[PDB]
Design a protein around this ligand. Structure first.
Ligand SMILES: Nc1ncnc2c1ncn2[C@@H]1O[C@H](COP(=O)(O)OP(=O)(O)O)[C@@H](O)[C@H]1O
Ligand SMILES: [Mg+2]
Ligand code: NA
Length: 379
């Protein structure tokens, strides 16, 4: 049986397999090449992935996401205390370890973050097994470069709960470098910069690769900047537009805000390949349909500060690595938000016209490299 590579992402996960001389990224039951890192509990079912994200507006209190923000942390960690003020689901304290508390099949239940992530990993495993036609038991799983031993342990524990032998836990930027074959270089230092703008986090990493050996030279970014912020800019824009068109404020109707958010995320994706997108939300608010449009240019304006803010962590990482821009051999795009043309323009311009490595879907590069590594480890 082939071993698999799994990107267990903050917002989206992705699974790949290396066989027959190549990596294939595996689409799920809906045809999607990435799967939301979401788990929902209802009066009757446990839903994972697309099914879980697709009912978030209906069931906010029992739809769990962002488990990766809790994994391997203590309850009293300032990160946990701060993050929990912003989630619709309850987080409780059990022996200074956080647990997510939900209603499931009529009963109050609580789960450790690694249990929630194990459910995501189970879905990713099953996605792979549907493609391969047999059970999968070996995996490489990735984590952020900044993850500590506790966060790495708990991630491993998630994989083991999901029925996987975890061949190795490897760093996301390293996996992305592997995807581009940058681990084969030979003697002589190669400096690689990974620019990873995802769904909820932004990570810049500078790696030095010397004869297949990776050193993390510098890291920077913002653990609370990502696609969700661009979605929100669009939300506030369309909230205002609805007010002017229909003289109604939808902002206190949680379901309406969430449904508009979904539509905004979709329109955003479309604007990476088209210069205009249509939004059509049946019965957005009090039976009023919301049928509108937005241009790529207007989207870029709404997010201009946030897009530009990605450059200073690049500046900082270069300073910390003691490297000039011209000393970076390769620039690698990771994370779905790097599909945004304005983001690519900013980074390319900052690097004075340098090529960006983007031939592998950026939201798939980590899984792609994990899959290669998994195959290497199997022999
Ligand atoms: N074509 C696209 N254009 C703009 N953003 C996109 C596109 N495709 C996916 N995204 C965004 O990428 C983000 C997810 O990034 P991804 O790398 O899949 O997950 P993660 O950051 O959790 O690892 C989401 O905010 C999503 O809306
Ligand atoms: Mg990611
Ligand atoms: Na991901």
């Amino acid at each position: 049986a082939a071993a698999i590579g799994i990107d267990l992402g903050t917002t989206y996960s992705c699974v790949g397999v290396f066989q027959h001389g190549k990596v294939e990224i595996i689409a799920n039951d809906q045809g999607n090449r990435t799967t939301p890192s979401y788990v929902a509990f209802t009066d009757t079912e446990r839903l994972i992935g697309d099914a879980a994200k697709n009912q978030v507006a209906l069931n906010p209190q029992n739809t769990v996401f962002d488990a990766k923000r809790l994994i391997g942390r203590k309850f009293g960690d300032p990160v946990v205390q701060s993050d929990m003020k912003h989630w619709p689901f309850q987080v409780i304290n059990d022996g200074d370890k956080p647990k997510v508390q939900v209603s499931y099949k009529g009963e109050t239940k609580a789960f450790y973050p690694e249990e929630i992530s194990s459910m995501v990993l189970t879905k990713m495993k099953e996605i792979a097994e549907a493609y391969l036609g047999y059970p999968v038991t070996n995996a490489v799983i990735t984590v952020p470069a900044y993850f500590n031993d506790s966060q790495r342990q708990a991630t491993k524990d998630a994989g083991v709960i999901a029925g996987l032998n975890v061949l190795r836990i490897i760093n996301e930027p390293t996996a992305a470098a592997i995807a581009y074959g940058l681990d084969r270089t030979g003697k002589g230092e190669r400096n690689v910069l990974i620019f990873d703008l995802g769904g909820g986090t932004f990570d810049v990493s500078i790696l030095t690769i010397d004869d297949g050996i990776f050193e993390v030279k510098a890291t920077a970014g913002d653990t609370h900047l990502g696609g969700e912020d661009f979605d929100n800019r669009l939300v506030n824009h369309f909230v205002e537009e609805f007010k002017r068109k229909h003289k109604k404020d939808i902002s206190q109707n949680k379901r309406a805000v969430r449904r508009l958010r979904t539509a905004c995320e979709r329109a955003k994706r479309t604007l990476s390949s088209s210069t205009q997108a249509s939004l059509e939300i049946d019965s957005l608010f009090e039976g009023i349909d919301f049928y509108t449009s937005i241009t790529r240019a207007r989207f870029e304006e709404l997010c201009s500060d946030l897009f530009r803010s990605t450059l200073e962590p690049v500046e900082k990482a270069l300073r910390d690595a003691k490297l000039d821009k011209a000393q970076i051999h390769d620039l690698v795009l990771v994370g779905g938000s790097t599909r945004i043309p304005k983001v690519q323009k900013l980074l390319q311009d900052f690097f004075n016209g340098r090529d960006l490595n983007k031939s592998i879907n950026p939201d798939e590069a980590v899984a792609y490299g994990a899959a290669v590594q998994a195959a290497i480890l199997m022999g």
